[PDB]
Structures are given as structure tokens and as C-alpha cells.
């Protein structure tokens, strides 16, 4: 017997689902959402890290003949200098002055901690969300794990569950992201084509296989002075260090729904948005027939206190005649107010207590006992006046009952002010009909 329902995607929020197939005693289902998560698809464009400026020992050759060459390793700067007269602790070496060759070369490479201190870039895509759900009913209580995608099953027993597609996808991730040591950012990086010398990804090398280490760090050599041996060059500092120093305000403190983010499968956990549908099939052997626990008779309700909106303040009393004791499911039909307790036993006295909660001031819920149902309204005045350190346990819909007991006189005075106009219209019609003749 398939049945459908919708549950708000709020962690730590009990949900009631009552099944009312005829010919059997109606029962209830407790739904709990325990740490839903979301995971996107990754692409791993390229990797960033520091650069090492590999500069070999300078070449002094005392003949004056030039020697120029250029290999294929990245960003050689083929510079040769003539007329240099180097010095050394032994005073000087060689004899000829103004005829010497200085060959100084340098390039860049990755660092030794590139395996560890590197940062990664990724692209966003369609994202699939984990959902860990706890299901319970009469003498059954079990957890599971699903996909809440278009199709999936649970099979907690003889019953099966399917969690339909998500209502919407307000993913905190978007377009392209950067991942670095247990943290992500929504920073637009330059593409693989090129990058500015120092902003970010000055090295835009690909995966750790270390092939085609592109670099645009803008080397520039200079002529050494006549004092001693020199290898002068100009080199802007690494942009990776500047980006690390600035960092700040990680995406963990920027989720638009307070959605704590982890990093192992780059996942985001424990955030509420939209609602999830559900369709469940329950076997006929999971419940008793109508021949058990008939407790209809007559029924009336009373409310003691309704200190509302905090955890549970709606203390209600139910009185009724009944047959032999047994179990009895209870719920609320309307969603104005919601109760906490699931199916509750009945004693021969016929008096039971319920704890409901609401957000309005004149609730008009219809509490239904496992076979009957009656109207039940309360004078729910007292507004709790503090600030709560825990979660909510009711729907946010607040509106006084149309009939109610609070705004009745406002409605009747408005009706009277309308009635004066109606009587004026009627007397005008009478007068004009009389004078038309």
C-alpha cells in the first residue's frame, strides 16, 4: 500500500506520518533526519605551490670569446657579460682585464614540499546529496542511508521507502573553487592559458606528475658590479605566499544556510533547504486489524496551559469511554499545531495527557485518537519571553483562527460597519423604486 508525504529537510526535527488505510487500526511513523550531506563533482584543473629559483654557479671564462646556448627547460634568460674583472679572497685570479666572459643562467622549478603544501583547483558540477534517515514505528527502530535521488530503496524490513528528487539546489559551491588543507574558497582563479606574475597561480602546473611546469614569474638578470663576483637578478615574491597570508573569511563562515563544510570528499553537511518527498510501501503484516483497541465512544478535550513556541507548552487532557486497554495512535490532522508523543496506551479510567506545541495564539487543531477525531481549540495566550538556546519544534506558520476566540469582535464590528452600508444600499433601492413609478 503505497503512500506519499513531504518532510522539511531540517536536522534534529521529528516528523509524524500517520497511515489511515481502512479496515485496520491507523498507525504512525517517526521520521528523523540525521546529518544530511552534499557532494559535487570535481575536475582538478591544475595545482599551485612555491617556486625554487635554481641558479648554478656563475661561469667565468678568461678568454673573452662569447658562448651562447639555450636548452628547452623553462624560462632560460640567455645573458652574457663582457669586460668583467672579478675579485676573490686570493686578491685576484688571471691577468687580462676588460676581456673576460661572465655566463650566468637561472630558471625556476617546483619546491620540495610540493607534495604536501600544494593547493588544488576544481570545477563545480551537478551534486548528489547523502541523507541518513532514522525510521521507527510500532516495535521497530532502525537507521539507514539513502540517496534522496530519483530512485533508491531502503528495505528496513517488509516495508520499502523511496526519497524523491530534491526541491531545489542552492549549492554553496559554484563554478570554480579552490581547496587547500581542510578549507575551500569561492575565488575565481585565472585560466590555464596564463596568469599575472604574482596574483595567484603564478605557477599553474598540472597534476603532481610534474610535466610542463608553466611559470610566468618574470625573471630579469643584471650586469654584475666590478667589486666582486655577483649573480644579480630581479624576482617578484611568490603569489602563493601572499594568497596564504591574506586568505581570510573561509567559505565555512560564508554558507548562505549555515552549512558546515568538510573536505575529505569535499562535502557540505548539516544544512536545511527545501523539503524532501517520500513514498513508502508497508506490508499488510505490520499491523493489527480493527478488532483490536476500539476506543471511539464519545470524546471531549480540555487544555490546561499553552505556554507556547519554545519546546512544548500545550498540556492537553483527553477524556473518553473505551473498551479493554491497548495501544492507540494519535496525531494532528491540521498543521497549525503538532504533538510530540507517538501511539500511547489507554487505561480503563479514560483520561490521557498530551503535549502539543504551536506558533499561533488561537490554535484550532483536530487531535485524532486511533479511531475517532474531535475539534479542539485552546486559549493560548501566554507568550514565552526569553531567548532559547536550542531548536524549534513547530511550523513557522502563524495565523489566528478565522472563527477563533481572540479577533471575533473585530470581525463582527467590521461586519457591522459593512451592514450599515448594506442597509443604506437597500433603503436607496427602496426609495428609487418608489420614486421611479
Amino acid at each position: 500500500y503505497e503512500h506519499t508525504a513531504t518532510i522539511p529537510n531540517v536536522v534534529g526535527f521529528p516528523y509524524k506520518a500517520h497511515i489511515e488505510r481502512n479496515g485496520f487500526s491507523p498507525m504512525t511513523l517517526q521520521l528523523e533526519v540525521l546529518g544530511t550531506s552534499l557532494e559535487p563533482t570535481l575536475n582538478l584543473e591544475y595545482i599551485t605551490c612555491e617556486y625554487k629559483t635554481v641558479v648554478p654557479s656563475p661561469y667565468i671564462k678568461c678568454c673573452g670569446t662569447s658562448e651562447c646556448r639555450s636548452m628547452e627547460r623553462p624560462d632560460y634568460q640567455c645573458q652574457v657579460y663582457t669586460g668583467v674583472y672579478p675579485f676573490m679572497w686570493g686578491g685576484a685570479y688571471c691577468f687580462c682585464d676588460t676581456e673576460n666572459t661572465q655566463l650566468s643562467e637561472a630558471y625556476v622549478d617546483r619546491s620540495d614540499v610540493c607534495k604536501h603544501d600544494h593547493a588544488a583547483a576544481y570545477k563545480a558540477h551537478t551534486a548528489a546529496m547523502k541523507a541518513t534517515i532514522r525510521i521507527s514505528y510500532g516495535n521497530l527502530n532502525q537507521t539507514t542511508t539513502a540517496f534522496v535521488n530519483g530512485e533508491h530503496t531502503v528495505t528496513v524490513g517488509g516495508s520499502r521507502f523511496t526519497f524523491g528528487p530534491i526541491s531545489t539546489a542552492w549549492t554553496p559551491f559554484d563554478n570554480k573553487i579552490v581547496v587547500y588543507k581542510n578549507d575551500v574558497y569561492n575565488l575565481d582563479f585565472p585560466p590555464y592559458g596564463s596568469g599575472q606574475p604574482g596574483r595567484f597561480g603564478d605557477i599553474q602546473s598540472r597534476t603532481v606528475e610534474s610535466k610542463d611546469l608553466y611559470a610566468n614569474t618574470a625573471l630579469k638578470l643584471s650586469r654584475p658590479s666590478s667589486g666582486t663576483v655577483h649573480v644579480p637578478y630581479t624576482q617578484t615574491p611568490s603569489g602563493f605566499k601572499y594568497w596564504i597570508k591574506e586568505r581570510g573569511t573561509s567559505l565555512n563562515d560564508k554558507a548562505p544556510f549555515g552549512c558546515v563544510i568538510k573536505t575529505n570528499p569535499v562535502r557540505a553537511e548539516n544544512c536545511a533547504v527545501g523539503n524532501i518527498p517520500v513514498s513508502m510501501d508497508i506490508p499488510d503484516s505490520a499491523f493489527t486489524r480493527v478488532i483490536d483497541a476500539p476506543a471511539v465512544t464519545n470524546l471531549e478535550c480540555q487544555v490546561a496551559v499553552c505556554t507556547h513556541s519554545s519546546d512544548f507548552g500545550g498540556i492537553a487532557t483527553l477524556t473518553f469511554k473505551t473498551d479493554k486497554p491497548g495501544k492507540c495512535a494519535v496525531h494532528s490532522h491540521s498543521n497549525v499545531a503538532t504533538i510530540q508523543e507517538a501511539a500511547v496506551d489507554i487505561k480503563t479510567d479514560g483520561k490521557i495527557t498530551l503535549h502539543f506545541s504551536t506558533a499561533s495564539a488561537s490554535p484550532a487543531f483536530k487531535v485524532s485518537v486511533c479511531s475517532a477525531k474531535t475539534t479542539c481549540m485552546a486559549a493560548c495566550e501566554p507568550p514565552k519571553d526569553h531567548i532559547v538556546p536550542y531548536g524549534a519544534s513547530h511550523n513557522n506558520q502563524v495565523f489566528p483562527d478565522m472563527s477563533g476566540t481572540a479577533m471575533t469582535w473585530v470581525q463582527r464590528v467590521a461586519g457591522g460597519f459593512g451592514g450599515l452600508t448594506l442597509a443604506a444600499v437597500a433603503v436607496l433601492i427602496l426609495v428609487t423604486c418608489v420614486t421611479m413609478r
Binding site: H308, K384, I387, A406, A424, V425, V431
Partner: protein, 105 residues
């Protein structure tokens, strides 16, 4: 710091995060005399409630003006002709204040 019915987080140093959100609170009796119902309904949801009060006042004044104008038009169509005719008076016994056409004699 502000706080609403949604939630506020904490990160003060290295302590575990703390989650708080505001209550429904407000003041005034919610099931008493007329001049606290508005205060209760206004303290909660400060916006769109004075709009409701203004709309109700506009409806009331429109109803009053419509009733007054209809009464005036009915009175005119009732006994304007007796203001006509050479001389003549109001029947009085047939009507003197039911339609109230009193203007000297």
C-alpha cells in the same frame, strides 16, 4: 549583534561553535482589551501590521463615507420635489423627521 528567528553562530577563539536563534517574545496581553491586541500583533512582525491597521482604517472610513453619501442621495431623491411647487409644506404626519426635510417654513 542582531538575532532573528533564523539563527546566529559563534566562533570566539577556538571554542566549539554555538547556535542561538531568537524566540517569539514581545509584550502585551494577546487575549485582552482592544488596546493591547494591536501591541501584541505589532511587536511580533513589526512590518505589515501597521499596514493592516491602515488598511482597516481606510476600509472603515470608506464605509462611513459611502453610507453618508448614500443617505444624502436618498434624502435628496426622497424630498427634493417638496422644496419645489409654489408654496406648499411638508406633510409632517406622513413624514417630518423620517426624511428630515426641515427648512424654516
Amino acid at each position: 549583534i542582531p538575532v532573528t528567528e533564523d539563527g546566529i553562530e559563534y566562533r570566539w577563539g577556538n571554542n566549539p561553535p554555538v547556535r542561538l536563534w531568537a524566540q517569539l517574545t514581545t509584550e502585551g496581553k494577546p487575549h485582552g482589551w482592544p488596546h493591547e491586541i494591536i501591541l501584541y500583533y505589532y511587536g511580533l512582525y513589526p512590518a505589515a501590521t501597521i499596514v493592516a491597521v491602515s488598511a482597516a482604517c481606510l476600509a472603515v472610513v470608506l464605509s462611513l463615507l459611502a453610507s453618508c453619501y448614500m443617505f444624502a442621495t436618498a434624502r435628496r431623491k426622497c424630498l427634493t420635489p417638496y422644496a419645489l411647487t409654489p408654496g406648499a409644506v411638508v406633510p409632517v404626519t406622513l413624514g417630518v423627521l423620517c426624511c428630515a426635510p426641515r427648512a424654516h417654513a
